[PDB]
Amino acid sequence: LDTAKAIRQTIANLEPFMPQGMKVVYPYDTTPVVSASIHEVVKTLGEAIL
Amino acid sequence: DIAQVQVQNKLQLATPLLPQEVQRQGIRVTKAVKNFLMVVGVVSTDGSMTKEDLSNYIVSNIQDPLSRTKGVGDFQVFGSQYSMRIWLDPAKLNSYQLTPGDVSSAIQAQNVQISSGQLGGLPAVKGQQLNATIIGKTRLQTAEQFENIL
Amino acid sequence: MSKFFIDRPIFAWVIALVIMLAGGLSILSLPVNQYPAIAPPAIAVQVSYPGASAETVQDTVVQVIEQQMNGIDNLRYISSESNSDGSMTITVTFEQGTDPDIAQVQVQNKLQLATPLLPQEVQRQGIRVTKAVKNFLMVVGVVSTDGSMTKEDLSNYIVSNIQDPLSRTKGVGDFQVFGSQYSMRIWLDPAKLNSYQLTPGDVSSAIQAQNVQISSGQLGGLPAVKGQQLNATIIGKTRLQTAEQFENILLKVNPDGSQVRLKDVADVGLGGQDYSINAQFNGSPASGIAIKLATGANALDTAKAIRQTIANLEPFMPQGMKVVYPYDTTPVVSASIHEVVKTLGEAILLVFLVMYLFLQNFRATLIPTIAVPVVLLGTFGVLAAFGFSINTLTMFGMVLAIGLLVDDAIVVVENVERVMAEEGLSPREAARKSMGQIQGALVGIAMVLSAVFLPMAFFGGSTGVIYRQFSITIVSAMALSVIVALILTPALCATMLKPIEKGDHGEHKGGFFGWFNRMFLSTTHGYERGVASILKHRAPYLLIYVVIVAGMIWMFTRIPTAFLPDEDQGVLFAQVQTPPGSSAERTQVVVDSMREYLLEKESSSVSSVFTVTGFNFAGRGQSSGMAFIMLKPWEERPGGENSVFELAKRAQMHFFSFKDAMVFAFAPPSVLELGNATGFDLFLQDQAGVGHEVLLQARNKFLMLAAQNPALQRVRPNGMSDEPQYKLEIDDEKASALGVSLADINSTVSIAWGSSYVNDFIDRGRVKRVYLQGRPDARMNPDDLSKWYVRNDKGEMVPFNAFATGKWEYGSPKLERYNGVPAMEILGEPAPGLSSGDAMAAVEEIVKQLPKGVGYSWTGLSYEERLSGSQAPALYALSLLVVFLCLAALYESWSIPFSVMLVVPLGVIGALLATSMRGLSNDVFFQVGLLTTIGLSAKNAILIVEFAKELHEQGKGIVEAAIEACRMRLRPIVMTSLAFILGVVPLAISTGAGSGSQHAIGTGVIGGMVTATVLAIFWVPLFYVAVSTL
Amino acid sequence: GASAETVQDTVVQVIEQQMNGIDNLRYISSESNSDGSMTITVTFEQGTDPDIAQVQVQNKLQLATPLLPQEVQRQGIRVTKAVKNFLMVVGVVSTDGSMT
Amino acid sequence: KQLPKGVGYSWTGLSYEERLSGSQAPALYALSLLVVFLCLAALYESWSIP
Ligand SMILES: CCCCCCCCCCCCO[C@@H]1O[C@H](CO)[C@@H](O[C@H]2O[C@H](CO)[C@@H](O)[C@H](O)[C@H]2O)[C@H](O)[C@H]1O
Ligand SMILES: CCCCCCCCCCCCO[C@@H]1O[C@H](CO)[C@@H](O[C@H]2O[C@H](CO)[C@@H](O)[C@H](O)[C@H]2O)[C@H](O)[C@H]1O
Ligand SMILES: CCCCCCCCCCCCO[C@@H]1O[C@H](CO)[C@@H](O[C@H]2O[C@H](CO)[C@@H](O)[C@H](O)[C@H]2O)[C@H](O)[C@H]1O
Ligand SMILES: CCCCCCCCCCCCO[C@@H]1O[C@H](CO)[C@@H](O[C@H]2O[C@H](CO)[C@@H](O)[C@H](O)[C@H]2O)[C@H](O)[C@H]1O
């Protein structure tokens, strides 16, 4: 998660100098499951404590 | 970190026994995981840039920076950076009795970046007032400059 | 716990006994050095590509190494310079904390991988990688009193005789000789070479031929023939050694039989390898070493050991060779250990006095004298555990601790002493009784104080390392001080104090003591009354409290903020930059019209000058010069007029008359390792290959724009400016049409002008380098090349003027890059009264007028302050929230904690007042001093509240509880403040080595101590009653 | 091709300069042979982390290396931990004498 | 001792280890008497027993 956020950040510090007909995209990408994973348990944490 | 140091510690015992064309190509030792974490692609908006134009972009401006973004173990660019490619024609080549090793050679005598010293050079004679850099031969950059190689 | 050790004085003594052993066995396994590692650890990758130009070095060496520098742990950023002298540096930068030895190795490894991608010529040179922190222990210098030896000579010596042993000298870490070994020098004559139709390249291939140790196998190797019986290695010939042997390596023989020896075409003599840099001691030829302290070493012991080792070498040193120690950080380190053991000693002496004067009994006077030293020994052990060292910061952090150490003792003893007096209880009984009273409070205050000093520690960066020292050593002592105030001291009180006749306050003793007790007895009665007065007419006072506050804030928004005090190190720098194009010979004088000047007109303050041609702080080149103006010990040059900061002003003005060479004076930074302490630091960067020239439009627009911006000042680009460079055009059309190759021309221009490092000979043992290039008068001016010919198809020498042509253009004398792309650094600073933050603000807007494809990023201290700056809110608020919660626990109340927190301002006003009133700045010492002063203050408040709450709960109304509380607390407070102020006075008015730090610390606690003492003794009871009334 | 005396004047001696000053150094012992071989053995106090003393070793040598003969710099100095004792030998013997 | 003044000596390996072991021994005995002394002089609240 850190190294992924670090990357979104290195590129975003580069987009402004990118040419015109050009956008940065994210084909494959493993982090989202992870965010979804715990975020989804945090979700269940609250349901149970309730 | 100890691993990497140990491999490379041994790796640099082979290195010299390796063929030059391989040493010259730059070897990479990395300490990273097996899975790709991700990939960052680039695509043309006004559809004006080829597969190859996007690749020269990545390796030429982004790749290093990611190379050094805390935590990137290793990377793979599905593409390449530009290169001054010289496509040899064996017919024209026969015409003047030339060989690739002739053109590989001219390129090494004519597309160079020599140390040339300077006027005010040290050590200098007593009295010398002027000093400037002497820029001799430089590297080409444009097809045109290579096209015109003697 | 405390009632446990009152009955166990021996056990209690055993604890103290191992605190003392641990601390003593620790004070001598402990490293001793000026500062911890403040700078972010950096690694320097270096090489000189002889005869090279900034562009060849950058594109042939630096870029390729940068392209494979990655996959490296804790890398903050990378930065490099390619120079006109063929040298370069690539400094990688990691987080503070990065393991240096590991960071290094990660960088040389990937260097290793890149080395085969480099020109064969740089590969041969080496490319040294090394740890680049600027924390030099001392710096010697082998200077020739006369003129017998040159810079090159002196060097080879230091590395032939002075080096190897110095490395075996205990404590010595890294060191750099100002120079390399001897290099066999061959200066080819274009004329004496054209006359035999010979070319430099004939010499190189030749030199190589007649100078190569041949393996030569064995005389009986394996397999062997049946028998032999005798096997012996066969040792062939060895490589050349003497200048003569080199003058012999024949090149060709004339048909008439006559032969041509190398001597027949050029000179031959041992010499320097690289002449780029020149250096003289007060004007005499010189070299030297720059040493660092080995990990864990003793700054003091090594200095002795260096001077030791050197001495045993001075006898045999040639006539004229004088060793010398221009710069040494030992005097400041030593004059800091004393200037602490002295204050520590005085403190315990002063405490005795105040302890007597008031308590009038020697026994009670012994206790504080036991505990304070116990605790001070402990702390060292505790630092040892933590891995800290005995440095400038850890020590002063001890000085600051003293108020708090002396305090814990005094409160414990004064309060037993008092209980015995009021209730006629006995030592034992009183001792239990006191500790029943306080005790929680002290655990309470140990917590609250940790919550006031710990958050600092959590700062990232450089300001984080400094603060972490003060923080960890202050709170270690504090925590120890409390432990000992709970185990030992109460035990010592029960054991060592005699009883007092209940109600006896000695107002009868007559004489001085007789007078004093009546005086103080009345003074107290006065105070309870004032306090009682205030507790009647409150609002008006709460009112005035609001004005104490508002004044604090306002007083904050007016005090000059700084990183660290303006220390007078015995040194001052002087940067010399002559006009672009200037020859070293020119610059050499521009730096002498200074030396002669400094060394003489300023003899009152100047001892010797160390000057250099070729090197500078903006760049390198013949137009780049500098002088390292030493100074004699602080002692032998008092009075502001002879301050490094005053010497400057003079030095400057003189140099002012210099419409021919930019000259500047400036005292070095407070902590060298960091350099630029005040201002901002950033790189302008081409993040789109826009190009040098474009990029340079940026740095010039940036500059002449930011200077229309009334938020910045002194904005100077850091690197160099393009000068004129003599380009060479080669018409190959006439080259191939003249029978002259093209590779032979290049080899000609390289191996004759730029120089060529060809072979490795053998010099008096070790191996050194053979250098081949044209004799001086053959490579000075554009016509000099016309002097050089090359053989053709046959053997017709073709002069360089028959196909080559000249042409002057503009080029970079110094190329820089930051994170892989070309870049340009700009310094400067904030406008008077404005903060570095504001300054970055203006800049964050300027940058927006940039050309397309140019970006920027902060570096160095601006990179850092931008990170620490952002956590402060969080830290400041955790500090408040835990002090709150701990006082809530102590008093069993959500509101009463407010009646001691509201003393913060009370004391911080007198600090702002005293410091501003003395012209000092809001720096490190002031800030940590302000936490110390407010810690003690709040301890005074806490106890008062605590007592009152007790009185209050044992059946007395709020205002009556507050009056009694303050009356009971006054003697304690007056004693610790009376004694703590006087302890610091000597720092407040000190002079000499390190006096600048001692002031930044004395001026702050005195002010904070005075106002805080006198004001909290009046407003806390107000606060306490004011909030209980709500 | 060089004598034990060369191996020492142009190699070992130089590498030893860099080895002085290393953390937790007990002693260093080197040997120069007449077959072009050498060994510098650098010894450290117990408790010293050996992975890290090697790295300090590599870091120091890298500064001697350029001052070595180019016949070595192209070669490659070997750096390894130093165990004084063999644990065992695993030999191989031919019975019918089929293999020498 | 019968060596040409110019040639000294210096122990190593096994020996080195020996000359150290000797060195330790004293303080080892001193400090060890101390710990036993203090621990008794605290566990029995007296100086007489220790
Ligand atoms: C109080 C401030 C005192 C400042 C003193 C500064 C004086 C320094 C003078 C240095 C003079 C030059 O000394 C310089 O030494 C460096 C090594 O460190 C040499 O470095 C040279 O050999 C080394 C290998 O040994 C190569 O890796 C390098 O590529 C090559 O340039 C230079 O060839 C030599 O010119
Ligand atoms: C994760 C752990 C973090 C812990 C942080 C909590 C910090 C706690 C600070 C120490 C406070 C100890 O406070 C302890 O208890 C109570 C207060 O409620 C007090 O006991 C009190 O009781 C009586 C009547 O109630 C009063 O006469 C008098 O004020 C005092 O004797 C003592 O002053 C102290 O012995
Ligand atoms: C009884 C003993 C009690 C005394 C000990 C108290 C210690 C003080 C605790 C502070 C240490 C916490 O460490 C600190 O955490 C905060 C909060 O996450 C961080 O702060 C981080 O998150 C916060 C909240 O989003 C941001 O506003 C902040 O700018 C960001 O840096 C700090 O950068 C970090 O340095
Ligand atoms: C018996 C007595 C005991 C007394 C001893 C108490 C020891 C307490 C020391 C705490 C040391 C904290 O360690 C320090 O944490 C800070 C803040 O998180 C780090 O700083 C880092 O943290 C935060 C992350 O949230 C970032 O915002 C910040 O930019 C980053 O650099 C330091 O790089 C680290 O060195």
Swiss-Prot record, chain A:
Question: Induced by what?
Answer: By growth under severe iron limitation.
Q: Which domain of life is it from?
A: Bacteria
Reported phenotype of the disruption mutant:
Disruption of MexA, MexB and OprM significantly reduces active efflux of N-(3-oxododecanoyl) homoserine lactone/3-oxo-C12-HSL/PAI-1, but not N-butyryl homoserine lactone/C4-HSL/PAI-2.
> Which locations, inside or outside the cell, does it occupy?
Cell inner membrane
Additional observations: Pyridopyrimidine derivatives, such as ABI-PP, are not exported by the MexAB-OprM efflux pump, bind tightly to a MexB hydrophobic pocket and so potentiate the activities of antibiotics such as erythromycin.
The job of this chain, per UniProt, is described as: The inner membrane transporter component of the MexAB-OprM efflux system that confers multidrug resistance. Functions as the major efflux pump for n-hexane and p-xylene efflux. Has been shown in one study to be involved in the active efflux of the autoinducer N-(3-oxododecanoyl) homoserine lactone, thereby playing an indirect role in quorum-sensing; but has been shown in another study not to be involved in efflux of this autoinducer. Over-expression of the pump increases antibiotic and solvent efflux capacities. Implicated in the secretion of the siderophore pyoverdine.
Tell me how this protein assembles: Component of the MexAB-OprM multidrug efflux complex, composed of six MexA subunits forming a hexameric tube, binding to a MexB trimer, which interact with the trimeric OprM outer membrane channel protein. OprM is thought to not directly contact MexB; instead, MexA joins MexB and OprM by forming a funnel-like hexamer anchored to the inner membrane. MexA may initially form a hexameric ring complex with MexB prior to OprM, then OprM undergoes a conformational change as it contacts MexA, allowing the periplasmic gate to open.
Report the family membership: Belongs to the resistance-nodulation-cell division (RND) (TC 2.A.6) family.
Its protein name is Multidrug resistance protein MexB
Source organism per UniProt: Pseudomonas aeruginosa (strain ATCC 15692 / DSM 22644 / CIP 104116 / JCM 14847 / LMG 12228 / 1C / PRS 101 / PAO1)
Measured against the full-length protein, the chain present covers: 300 to 349 of 1046
